[PDB]
Amino acid sequence: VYLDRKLLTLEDKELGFGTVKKGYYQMKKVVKTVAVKILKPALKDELLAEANVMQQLDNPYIVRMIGICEAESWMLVMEMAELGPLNKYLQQNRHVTDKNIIELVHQVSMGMKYLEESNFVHRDLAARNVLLVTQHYAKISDFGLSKALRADENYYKAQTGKWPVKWYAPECINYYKFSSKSDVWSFGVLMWEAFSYGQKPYRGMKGSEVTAMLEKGERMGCPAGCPREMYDLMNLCWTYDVENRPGFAAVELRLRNYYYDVVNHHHH
Ligand SMILES: NC(=O)c1cnc(N[C@@H]2CCCC[C@@H]2N)nc1Nc1cccc(-n2nccn2)c1
């Protein structure tokens, strides 16, 4: 996992803990374009824990880590997803079709089905953390809050924090318990963001007002032009009771089947 600084070439400009910069890494033969997270002891430990999670994952729909390097600061080197975050892409590309959005959120569900099978919880699943390789190829990124589940438990219990509350399930807020089912709830919010072309969820509401709304059984409305089948899936992800909420195997299957029905309608 330890990379050679002499083989890494960093660009001066910043793409976006610190910063994300574009670079190039000399591989065995080819040169590879990379995205590098550069830190600007708690930050070092967090980056190394993130590196430890990514090291264990191998799936076409999850950003691959190339390695780590300790130079000017600690650096986490990843494969580059040229088109950037999904929310920003859709805000700038409103012509993207409903079929293309289904294709991308289905890819995220495949990556998450893999993470669930791997017994890792993401804990920051949102459209800003889905990166586009192409307009037809999404990858999940940003494993800074992710956790490997213990062998005897299907959830992570947080003790302390600065949380993305609008993407969190009720049991995360009420019991500090994070599971693959909690990530399913976040995935419902991510689907809403995607079909709303990168609009922020729960516009104009405080985190506490969001909790109050959800407790009353109320949910965000259907985005303009969103297929009813996809809005129904969002509502199923937003099942209040964790036991009754589907896991990613059930979600990916529903998305897969619907995507094939849409691919069929297009051919007709
Ligand atoms: N492998 C990667 O390509 C990569 C992995 N992870 C991330 N993480 C960032 C953290 C900052 C928030 C946004 C995102 N979750 N960004 C990556 N690339 C990237 C590519 C183009 C643009 C940007 N970009 N545009 C605006 C901000 N960042 C990032």
Q: What CATH number has the domain bearing residue 237?
A: 1.10.510.10
- Which residue, among 115, 116, 137, 140, has the nearest Cα to 127 in the 3D structure? 140
The rounded Å distance from CA 141 to ligand 1 centre is 8
Strand partners of residue 62? 140
* Gap between the Cα atoms of 98 and 231, Å rounded: 12
Residue 236 and residue 111 share a domain: yes
CA pair distance 31, 239, nearest whole angstrom: 46
Asked if 138 and 223 sit in the same domain, the reply is yes
Q: Which of 46, 80, 114 is the last residue of a domain?
A: 80
Asked if 72 and 179 sit in the same domain, the reply is: no
Q: How far is the CA of 148 from the centre of ligand 1 (A)?
A: 23
> Are residues 212 and 267 both part of a single domain?
yes
Instruction: For 119, list phi and psi in degrees, rounded to 5.
Output: 60, 45
Would you give the distance in Å from CA 146 to the centre of its chain?
11
CA of 128, closest atom in ligand 1: 15
Question: Is residue 177 within 8 Å of 171, Cβ to Cβ?
Answer: yes
CA of 155 to the centre of ligand 1 (A): 28
Q: Is 202 left (phi over 0), alpha (psi -120 to 50) or beta?
A: left
> Ligand 1: does its nearest atom lie under 6 Å from the Cβ of 15?
yes
Residue located via tokens 């709303």: 196
Resolution in angstroms comes to: 1.8
Rounded to whole angstroms, how far apart are CA atoms 164 and 225? 27
Same domain, 90 and 43: no
- What's the 83 CA to ligand 1 centre distance in angstroms? 9
> Which residue's alpha carbon is nearest to atom 21 within ligand 1?
84
Known binding residue 131? Answer is: no
CA-nearest of 197, 207, 215 to 166 is: 207
Same domain, 204 and 134: yes
The structure's method of determination equals: X-ray
Domain end marker among 51, 80, 109: 80
Q: Is residue 95 domain-shared with residue 134, that is, in the same domain?
A: yes
261 catalytic, yes or no?
A: no
Residue 36 and residue 110: Cα distance in Å, rounded? 25
CA gap 112, 248 in Å, rounded: 6
CA 36 from centroid of its chain's CA atoms? 18
Say whether both 62 and 110 belong to one domain. no
Q: Which of 13, 15, 132 to mutate to test the pocket of ligand 1 (most atoms within 8 A of CB)?
A: 15
How far is Cα 158 from Cα 173, in angstroms, rounded to an integer?
10
Number of domains, the chain: 2
**Do 165 and 148 reside in the same domain of the chain?**
yes
Q: Are residues 190 and 200 in the same domain?
A: yes
Q: What is the CATH number of the domain that holds 49?
A: 3.30.200.20
**Same domain for 43 and 88?**
no
CA-CA distance, 140 to 232, in Å (whole number)? Answer: 23
Q: Is 17 annotated as a binding residue?
A: yes
Flag whether 18 is marked binding: yes
Domain edge (last residue) among 34, 55, 80: 80
Angle 180-195/248-267 helices, nearest 10 degrees?
Answer: 30
**Same domain (yes/no): 2, 20:** yes
DSSP codes, the chain: -B--GGGEEE-SS----EEEEEEEEE-SSSEEEEEEEEE--HHHHHHHHHHHHHHT---TTBPPEEEEEESSSEEEEEE--TTEEHHHHHHH-TT--HHHHHHHHHHHHHHHHHHHHTTEE-S--SGGGEEEEETTEEEE---TT-EEPPTT-SEEE-------GGG--HHHHHH-EEEHHHHHHHHHHHHHHHHTTTPPTTTT--HHHHHHHHHTT--PPPPTT--HHHHHHHHHHT-SSTTTS--HHHHHHHHHHHHHHHHHHHH-
Which entry of 4, 12, 98, 124 is annotated as an active-site residue? Answer: 124
Q: Which domain holds residue 146?
A: 81-268
Q: Provide the token pair at 219.
A: 């949910």
